Amino acid sequence: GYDLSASTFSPDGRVFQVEYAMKAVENSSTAIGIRCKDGVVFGVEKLVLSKLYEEGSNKRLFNVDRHVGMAVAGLLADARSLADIAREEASNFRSNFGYNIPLKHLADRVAMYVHAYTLYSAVRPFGCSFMLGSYSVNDGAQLYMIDPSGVSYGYWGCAIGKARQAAKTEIEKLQMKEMTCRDIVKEVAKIIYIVHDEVKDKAFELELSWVGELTNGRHEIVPKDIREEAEKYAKESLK
């Protein structure tokens, strides 16, 4: 028994608790994010476990700051806790240094917070992965992902959850470098609809958000009209 605490190494040099935490997020619905010239776009496949939930309930897209988004996958409690921590870090940075927190700095800080929970037996690794997206004229579009192990990397496009491999394969055909957010929204809808498994999942609702020049640097939920257009495009694609 070498996998009962995060403070014990396996004889082959692994921290098994972090692997189990990673496996926890792999059992959740996929949530992809794509970076473009204008900005970044986030999509989440929200499974409707029952028809008794209000549309928008259990939202998995958060606004850590007015210029930084957040899409989560895994245990939703830990995701909300880390969203609160990111909000606190951004507010503290603004109060102390007097300007909006750079996305790379926020990602590094939150990752180090996650990493601090992967060293002691008094705490357990976070069971959630998430991606942050921001846009600024000085800094441009950015997209980062943080895993339970605390690894932060910058992505042009990333997926977290059950269908990470399929989403990554479908994203690779998007030549996202020279596209705008308008086309990326439709592409994200199509990708989410492709990766979704109807046999396993009963039904799902598409949640989208973006931050870019079109939004004047503010992270906000996509207007319902654009969501409906993207959904119709996705249905047309699966003919």
Binding site: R87, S91, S95, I221
Partner: protein, 212 residues
């Protein structure tokens, strides 16, 4: 702030049919010295609230930072609930009372205006926690010079129009400039209506008759 360093003069305010209007000169006085002459003493809390200030300017900046952060936090959740002018007034009152009790007061005298749910608001907050709502407000030396004119006009005519309110504020600002040693010609006007919050540029009390 036991010993205030950079201070501001009166802030005026009067509520009309459809909103409120606030005024304040752009001047930071270092004890009988017009040190800084291009500083705004009015802040936009949100789409339905604006806040003037007097007293220490550093305390005003600290309150600006804190209140802005609270507004950002509220806007992040996106739950459809926004701080109302009364909520901001109550929070400011509690903060000032706590600081006074700790004997580390925020040397400021703030005026809060807003227009939410089709109703106007105009409040007062002193460094000691005194807070009240009245149709017209004047802090600092305005309570002696400008307040009488506002009170007379309002007692004559309880409900004012935007043009009348702006004219009244201009006249009161002119009087304060005449009879206040720490006032400055340039000032700002902030109006809140159903269209949001608008802050007017550096207007001047050009109507300065000097018949000796």
């Amino acid at each position: 702030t036991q010993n205030p360093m950079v201070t501001g003069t009166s802030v005026l305010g009067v509520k009309f049919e459809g909103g409120v209007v606030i005024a304040a000169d752009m001047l930071g006085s270092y004890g009988s010295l017009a040190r800084f002459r291009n500083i705004s003493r009015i802040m936009r809390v949100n789409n339905s609230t604006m806040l003037g200030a007097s007293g220490d300017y550093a305390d005003f900046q600290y309150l600006k930072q804190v209140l802005g952060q609270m507004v950002i936090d509220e806007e992040l959740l996106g739950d459809g609930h926004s701080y109302s002018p009364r909520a901001i007034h109550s929070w400011l009152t509690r903060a000032m009372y706590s600081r006074r009790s700790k004997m580390n007061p925020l040397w400021n005298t703030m005026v809060i205006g807003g227009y939410a749910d089709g109703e106007s608001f105009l409040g007062y907050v002193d460094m000691l926690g005194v807070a009240y709502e009245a149709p017209s407000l004047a802090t600092g030396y305005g309570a002696y010079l400008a307040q009488p004119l506002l009170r007379e006009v309002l007692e004559k005519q309880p409900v004012l129009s935007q043009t009348e309110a702006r004219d009244l504020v201009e006249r009161c600002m002119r009087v304060l400039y005449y009879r206040d040693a720490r006032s400055y010609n340039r000032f700002q006007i902030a109006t809140v209506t159903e269209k949001g919050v608008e802050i007017e540029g550096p207007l001047s009390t050009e109507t300065n008759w000097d018949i000796a």
